[PDB]
Amino acid sequence: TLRDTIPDCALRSQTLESLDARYVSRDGAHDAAVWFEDMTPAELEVVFPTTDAKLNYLSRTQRLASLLTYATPDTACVHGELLARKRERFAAVINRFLDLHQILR
Amino acid sequence: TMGGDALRVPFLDFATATPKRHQTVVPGVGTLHDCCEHSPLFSAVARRLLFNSLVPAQLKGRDFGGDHTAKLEFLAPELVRAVARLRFKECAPADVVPQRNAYYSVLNTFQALHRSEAFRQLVHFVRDFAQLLKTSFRASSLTGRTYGTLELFQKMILMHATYFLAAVLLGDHAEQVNTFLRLVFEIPLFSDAAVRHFRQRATVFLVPRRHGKTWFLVPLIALSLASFRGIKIGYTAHIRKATEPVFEEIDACLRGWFGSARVDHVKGETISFSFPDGSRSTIVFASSHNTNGIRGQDFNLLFVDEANFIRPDAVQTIMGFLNQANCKIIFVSSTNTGKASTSFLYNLRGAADELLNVVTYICDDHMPRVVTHTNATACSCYILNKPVFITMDGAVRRTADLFLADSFMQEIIGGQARETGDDRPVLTKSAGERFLLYRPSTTTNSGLMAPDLYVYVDPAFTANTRASGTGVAVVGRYRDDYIIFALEHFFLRALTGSAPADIARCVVHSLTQVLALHPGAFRGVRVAVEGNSSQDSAVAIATHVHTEMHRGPELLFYHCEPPGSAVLYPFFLLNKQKTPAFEHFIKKFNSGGVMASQEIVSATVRLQTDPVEYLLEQLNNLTSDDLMVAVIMAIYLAAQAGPPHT
Amino acid sequence: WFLVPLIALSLASFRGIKIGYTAHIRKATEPVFEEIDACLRGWFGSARVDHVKGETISFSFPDGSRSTIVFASSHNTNGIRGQDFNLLFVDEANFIRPDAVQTIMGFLNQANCKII
Amino acid sequence: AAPVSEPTVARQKLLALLGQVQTYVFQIELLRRCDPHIGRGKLPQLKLNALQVRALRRRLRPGLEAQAGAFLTPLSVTLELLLEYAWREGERLLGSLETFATAGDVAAFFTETMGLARPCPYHQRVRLDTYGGTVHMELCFLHDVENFLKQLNYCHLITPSRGATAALERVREFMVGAVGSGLIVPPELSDPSHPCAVCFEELCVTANQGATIASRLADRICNHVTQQAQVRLDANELRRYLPHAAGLSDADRARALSVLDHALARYAISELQFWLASGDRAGQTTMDAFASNLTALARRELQQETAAVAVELALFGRRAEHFDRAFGSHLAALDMVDALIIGGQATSPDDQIEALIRACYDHHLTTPLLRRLVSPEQCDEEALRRVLARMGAGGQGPETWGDIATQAAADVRERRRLYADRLTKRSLASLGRCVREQRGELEKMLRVSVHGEVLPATFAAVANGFAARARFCALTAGAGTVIDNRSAPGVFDAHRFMRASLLRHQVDPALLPSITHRFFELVNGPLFDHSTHSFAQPPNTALYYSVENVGLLPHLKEELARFIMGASGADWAVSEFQRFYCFDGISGITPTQRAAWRYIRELIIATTLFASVYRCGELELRRPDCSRPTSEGRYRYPPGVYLTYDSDCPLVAIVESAPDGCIGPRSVVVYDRDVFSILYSVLQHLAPR
Amino acid sequence: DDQIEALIRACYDHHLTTPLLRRLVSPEQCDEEALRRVLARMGA
Amino acid sequence: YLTYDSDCPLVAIVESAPDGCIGPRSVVVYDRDVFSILYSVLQHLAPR
Amino acid sequence: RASLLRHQVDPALLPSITHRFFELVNGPLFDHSTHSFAQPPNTALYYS
Ligand SMILES: [Zn+2]
Ligand SMILES: [Zn+2]
């Protein structure tokens, strides 16, 4: 009793809105289940087999994407300037963090 | 007695599609994916709604909802009736067998903290403190403003005491107790660093005249004794004529809202609270300063009352207590602004961190007293009880006439005036310290330098005056920052016949040294001689610099076409560009973008003081300035403007 | 922490010894008094605990016997004449107590004394 | 003890649903980077999950709608954000996946999902819309939501109700996009330099050695609107989990391991020199150690990459092109810093901090200046011991090089040793702070930052005040006998009579503290409470917090602290006949707030003098922003005179409400603008009893 | 009373003095300070 | 028990007997790894 | 392993761990820790 949506649909040649109107938006829809399918692909678990490893990659690619979009002619975005300032300050901070410990010796 | 309803919930075995290799168990909820632990937006909501059950009802607040902490756990009736008809899946049998075990076992370590008397001691201490301060500290029985208020330091002291006593009496629960004391002090969202700060020992307090200094420590002790079991709070003081009042005010309430049978009292010495099962905790008074306090067993507090003028020959027992392994010498004090600097303790701020805290109402600069104005208590605001006899004056002129150190006191006259006049510092102390300490070695990182030197000379053409110094700076670009290669603060010999050449010889000597230290680095040196003082004298300096340098890098001068003239003179006129130059400098300096060369050159500032240290003393006057002006302007020139030439 | 149980058990077990317990300045000996008599009266009956302040402590036995811990900390008298001391638990000999070495050297002459 | 309340099991059900939805958003953020050919395999799963999220609303929709209008809580705010971000990004990614298999190109799939061709959808317009002047701000960053919610909190006595709960729906529309993920924060909208509202209380509560907070607040990373998540990643993570995979029930789990071992047996480090370098070059240096560590890290990364490629080839047959490979050409032409910030999908962002610390800290550093870092508490303890012990008891000017060069060489020979002896003998307390600050500023930039619990908490704390005010405005309209007095056919007489009868008495200067407190209690906002805690604080402190966070000019704090310090009829009565809360002739933000402080002072002093003259009334001066709801749909507004801050009908006098608290048929209430007419109407009721 | 206000606003501006202005706005603190001074001078 | 034996080191005796010996009411868990031993101990001791 | 590696070692328990380490590492010959007048396990290990 109280079946899920995956035993309900059984057909996947359609658009999302049709299925919405046919299974979840009908007045007679019993809607008596909540079960989120596992969407991670095995072709990705076999290489990143750890939530920490799946999060480090998910953050590295996020940083890459945020670098690529900010690097017709508007160019007047505060986020590009913020990323530039952050990169410059990070470079200048690591600069005075290796030399400072070179001096202390 | 059983607490709230958040630690008794049933299983709610919804479902999971994640492999057991990933799933984690959050207490109070089922078993969810591992990604729900690196997301604080969930692991900080699912954990706060748990410890919001251990918190008693006398600690939620004063208007928090009748039955629950509405600000954390409240669902509208419509939403409750809507999520009621929401039904998850049902866990598979082979998966529900271990899931229920994991769930009811990860929750047992909470229904086990709610029972241990070691934690019940802390809960009782905090709840009694709250319920007994509700009506301000008085002779109540413990059975329009009507609720008492702890000022800021009266709360910092309570936190310093409670967090340490919890970390000491509860070591096996150093995680379930931090995130409970957070909820009990209404201090969540607080990183573990700024809470572990309260775990440290020997945190000195400097308090103004009265501020309920003594009125607060006696209830603190009375509740920290009759709640915990196995601590001996040492309470030293000044001359022991002041400690007997503490005796009486502790034992009056300690016997007032409790039974006298458990109140053990000997005159002039220790006081002891006994518990109905062979337990006793005392407040043994180290005020004798002779014996009975050298051997330490469970002191852990050492409530030193007044460390302003330390008691004679009583520092030996204190320093011996500092050797005890679990002692947190609270070190209360009272600088009543009658001296404003208990330099016996105030010198601690020199080399230390997170040690002492001052409850001050006037800053270092006595002009921005309005910084801490809305914080000064309203009870201590009494005046002559008459604004004016007959006068119509605004609050500004009234407070000017009625200044009296802004607190009816007789604070130090001089220095920072009474009318603030929008006076503030400009360069942060932190950037200043880094300017002093981190100095790139330019002679060995020459590849990082731009091939142009910029020099500014800000001349003074008098002698035998303190403002008669000539400032010289030679700077350049280092990466995208600015670095100082040389500094001079030069003082004319009196009645020389050649002041411009003396100044020129000074700058040429500086340049030469900079050039020799970095051979082949520079293609150009650009020189600006400020001409505000004397155009002719500035021109003469440029001419001598020009000639002397003629004995490679090309030498260019900034030129100026004075108003109404067609002539280009080799001087610089400082006017409209001052404000932009200063503004840019301040921003660059504060962000770490201006520095001094490790091998910075100075002939004139070498024997008495470090040149960078000397420059920084001038710079800290931003709100004799020849050096500061030369440095700021040399940098502005290295920055961007109109072209200077040959 | 170890010598007080040692004494408390070496008194209430043997019969006929008088353990001398000297120390530094006598401000440190009264703590020994209290920590010996608290347990000696704790895990035993107070009737057999004979105690005089600042001086000897005595344990009595149900058949006309008594063994004491007479305190030579006074360093003046009551310790020169030795009968059954045999222990002389000198606590801190790092900086010897002023003018207290004479009684110690006299105790060294006693035939059955083991100055710990 | 068996019966547990429904709003307790409902909260657990909502927490479970929040966990499931957070997991789903994680899977979504993963599929936005996997190869499309593999993502298309999970097309039915993604479609089913989007269907489930759609069906999850339309049930929580009315519940969360009735919640948003009555006392939001930090649970149903993050729940709304996540159920919106899922319903958004799931459908967006599904559209981007169904666009695939039609064009069949990958480099244009990672420009749709990862958003490389968007017009930067991180901008918004707030238009606070106060009284007198409608100031408008734009929400670009994460701290720009904190600095707007604190502004709307401070300017709450000046802002209409439905003009604020319509500028909060414009903040939530941005938060759904920025903090809606709740799992990772894009580097664009995160400025850790700007301090938050809870790291201002840190400095107020922790120890300050002089150094007023205005100067301590500028050396902070604020660590609360974004966190660090402390991700750790082992070395041989691929070889560990290879013999244990989801499918692979065949012996292929052995041949895959064989190919892994066979391929294992089978950063632009050349750019460090252009950085600033000090000291001697011959021999070991910090730069050399850093280069060696980075080379080791790059070698581990390359080995992991080739092993992953070989394993995917041997197991499934096709080498997949994920985001880090389809755009792998842009990971080659990367500078040292641009590839140090990002990078290390094999290593961890903590391994780079390890490689830096192992380079800056060797056995040759020093005896001192090394123990203060490993124990910054023993240093201050020793300093305290030291403090206690000390307090217990000419001519021949040369032209050529041979002389000026020699004198400059001597001067630099002295000065290079001067500061070198400064950094070692003195300046230990300054170095122990500079290094522990640069290290924090580094770890905050390199570690994986996720999200902080601040925004969905302060948003709720701010919105609850306006929700409660709009709720009290409309809950009293439906009551028993209403005596609405905003129409004045015969009220001038009773207003002037009472104003004259009250202006005849002095303010009783023995009551000025009890008036200053009730002024700082009305003026303060709903966010910074600090006065209804169990360990309460004086209302002046709860106001200092709320007024110092939003940077207020110092020349206005005296106008606030010294407002009722002076209290005749001048500066006493400011309201006209019916224009009590009217800001018609005032524009701006500060001169529009002075006019509100004046009305609040007039109300407080008039109520005090009315309690003093006509002793019959009690006149508990209350505020509707308090009285949070109990277990369900009950608010129990007690009797008193509420300010309500609403320029439409400000003063609401609840003289006799009910014996249980609610507002029903025995709840005669008096609406009015003016204060003295309110007091007259209260007198006409409370007196004949 | 407005004429008295117009006279006082004319005789009392911000430039009058630091002293001789606080004794009018508080003729009690002046005598209190005088008592303190007398007691301190007669003490020693 | 650690047992120091590289063949089957960790031996968890969760419920042995009310008198001490090892007989029919003496469910024991053999394992090499430690965390699996702890999981097997949890699956037994928790539902009691 | 994940559910246990999520917590710190509680540095208030390090003596009770060092003792149970010196008690496992020690051998059976030099007992010196189960006598009536026992000695700390570090001494029973120093002997062995
Ligand atoms: Zn943008
Ligand atoms: Zn912060």
Numbering used by the authors:
A (entry chain C): 12 to 82, 96 to 129
B (entry chain A): 35 to 177, 195 to 602, 614 to 685, 705 to 727
C (entry chain A): 266 to 381
D (entry chain B): 2 to 267, 306 to 432, 478 to 651, 654 to 775
E (entry chain B): 389 to 432
F (entry chain B): 728 to 775
G (entry chain B): 583 to 630
Question: What do the study authors state?
Answer:
Examples include herpesviruses and most bacteriophages, both of which replicate their DNA as head-to-tail concatemers containing multiple copies of the genome that must be cleaved to generate unit-length viral genomes. This is achieved using a “terminase” complex, which, in bacteriophages comprises two proteins, termed Large (TerL) and Small (TerS) terminases; but in herpesviruses contains three separate components—pUL15, pUL28 and pUL33—in hitherto unknown oligomeric forms. The terminase complex recognizes a specific sequence or structure on the concatemeric DNA and cuts it to produce the free end where packaging is initiated. Acting as the packaging motor, the terminase complex then hydrolyzes ATP molecules to translocate negatively charged DNA into a space-limited procapsid through a dodecameric portal. Each subunit of the hexameric ring is a heterotrimer formed by three proteins (pUL15, pUL28 and pUL33) interdigitating with each other.
Here we reported the atomic structures of a herpesvirus hexameric terminase complex in both the apo and ADP•BeF3 bound states at 3.5 Å and 3.6 Å. To elucidate the structural mechanism of viral DNA packaging, we determined the cryoEM structures of the hexameric and dodecameric terminase assemblies in the apo state at 3.9 Å and 4.6 Å resolution, with C6 and D6 symmetry respectively; and those of the hexameric and dodecameric terminase bound with an ATP mimic, ADP•berylliumtrifluoride (ADP•BeF3, a nonhydrolyzable ATP analog to mimic ATP in physiological conditions) at 4.3 Å and 4.6 Å resolution, respectively. Herpesvirus terminases are known to be a member of the additional strand, conserved glutamate (ASCE) superfamily of ATPases however, our cryoEM structure of the herpesvirus hexameric terminase assembly shows that its size, with an external diameter of ~225 Å and a height of ~100 Å, is substantially larger than the dimensions of most ASCE members. The central channel of the hexameric ring, having a funnel-like shape with an internal diameter of 39 Å, can possibly bind and translocate the dsDNA substrate using specialized basic residues that project into the central channel. Expectedly, the central channel of the hexameric ring has a similar internal diameter to that of the dodecameric portal in herpesviruses, also suggesting the role in dsDNA translocation. In our structures, six copies of the ATPase domain are arrayed around the interior of the ring, forming a “funnel” like structure with a central channel. Remarkably, a large basic patch of six residues, R291, K292, R306, R313, K318 and R331, that are highly conserved in herpesviruses and bacteriophages, is observed lining the central channel, which is believed to bind DNA during translocation.
